[PDB]
Amino acid sequence: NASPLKHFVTAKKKINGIFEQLGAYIQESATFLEDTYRNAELDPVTTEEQVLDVKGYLSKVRGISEVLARRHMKVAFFGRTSNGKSDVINAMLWDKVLPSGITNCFLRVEGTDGHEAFLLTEGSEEKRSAKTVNQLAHALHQDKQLHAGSLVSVMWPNSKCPLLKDDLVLMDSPGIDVTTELDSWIDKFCLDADVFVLVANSESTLMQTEKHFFHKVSERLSRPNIFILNNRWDASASEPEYMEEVRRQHMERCTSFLVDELGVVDRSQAGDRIFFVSAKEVLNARIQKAQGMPELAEGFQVRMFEFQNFERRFEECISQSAVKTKFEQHTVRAKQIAEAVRLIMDSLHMAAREQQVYCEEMREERQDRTRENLEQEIAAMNKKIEVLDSLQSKAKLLRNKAGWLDSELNMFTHQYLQP
Ligand SMILES: [Ca+2]
Ligand SMILES: [Ca+2]
């Protein structure tokens, strides 16, 4: 019964942990290199640039760790307001989080640990109370500096929703109409959206502007995850026969759109991207169930299960995709950084071994020469030789630790970053 979102949660913690270890390892390496480089008793076995490079990598790794700590899954919802996309988000969250059509901007729902909802617009990080959904709606309408290119974050309490605790963000978009100016949308707000949900009506033809947007999604993102939720499916409660016909036809239209028109999916998983739902039915049932209220429509259990099925296939989709797209570049960077430090330690090991061999040979030659200070001078070179030997041992250990991290990273890649 574990949410598939736990795959993301698990991978995020695992990659953050590796970067913690990578940072610790580079720190130890930097400390070792610096100490070595400052050793005025030896001919140089490392260089300032190697020290600076490894301090530089430490900085970069800590910087990346900060990005990795904040990475989250994002699903973005699109479509006409009248088709109910906001109710789909509300149903998924088991509550009336977003106002539902009678909202200018993008609404980005994020979990907060605080026990009260509030808004954060983004050009100004200034909040607005959102004690109720009506007061939320009025707070957006009150704010006339808002438009369909503004994003407000709806900070919604963690405790109410496990989706939000598992680092899911849910973005509602402005409702689409014919002349909705939306070519800004993908670059400004959707580059990090792991899933795009089109919420449509099974019987209403898709607007050209809606199709145009999902063309742009398919042109701008690499293998974007597109779901089509065909809302108001509860009409099947009273016209099951006609809605079954509608289902077959629209299932085929949506498949052709996803597979042939957009080319973002095979036919084999079309049934996993195209769902027929009744969001407000689900949301109503969930609001009552959350309170222990009892309860109805014909086909209701079937429609509730379909929505739950959508949710599960969505959570599997977003969790697996987001892990891949949001961690793969940093996993690759981490391997490159590990390899850079590995090779410096190998360079140091080798220069220390070469200088050791040199000092051993200087020791043998010293024993061919005058007996004045011979034992003192052989001892000083014995000590240098033993430092060079310890440096080699230390560098080999650090080099093998870099290989360990490469191995952790390879295994993370294998488990979490497959196509
Ligand atoms: Ca360099
Ligand atoms: Ca030897």
Residue numbers in the entry: 25 to 126, 130 to 322, 327 to 400, 706 to 755
Paper lines:
Outer mitochondrial membrane (OMM) fusion is catalyzed by the dynamin-like GTPase called mitofusin (MFN). We generated a modified human MFN2 construct with deletions of residues 1–21 and 401–705 (MFN2IM). MFN2IM contains a G domain and a helical domain 1 (HD1). In this study, we address these issues by presenting crystal structures of truncated human MFN2 in different stages of the GTP turnover cycle. These structures explain how MFN2 uses a primate-only single amino acid variance and a tighter G interface, as compared with human MFN1, to allow for enduring GTPase (G) domain association even after GTP hydrolysis, a feature that is unique in the dynamin superfamily and ensures efficient membrane tethering.
To investigate how Thr111 phosphorylation affects the function of MFN2, we solved the crystal structure of a phosphorylation mimic MFN2IM(T111D). According to the structure, the side chain of Asp111 is not fully exposed, and its phosphorylation may require a substantial local conformational rearrangement. Phosphorylated Thr111, as reflected by the Asp111 in the crystal structure, blocks the binding groove for GTP in the P-loop, and the negative charge is also disfavored for the phosphate groups of the nucleotide. Therefore, the putative phosphorylation at Thr111 is likely to directly inactivate MFN2 in mediating mitochondrial fusion. Intriguingly, we observed calcium ions (Ca2+) associated with the HD1 of both nucleotide-free wild-type MFN2IM and MFN2IM(T111D), and one of them is involved in intermolecular contact.
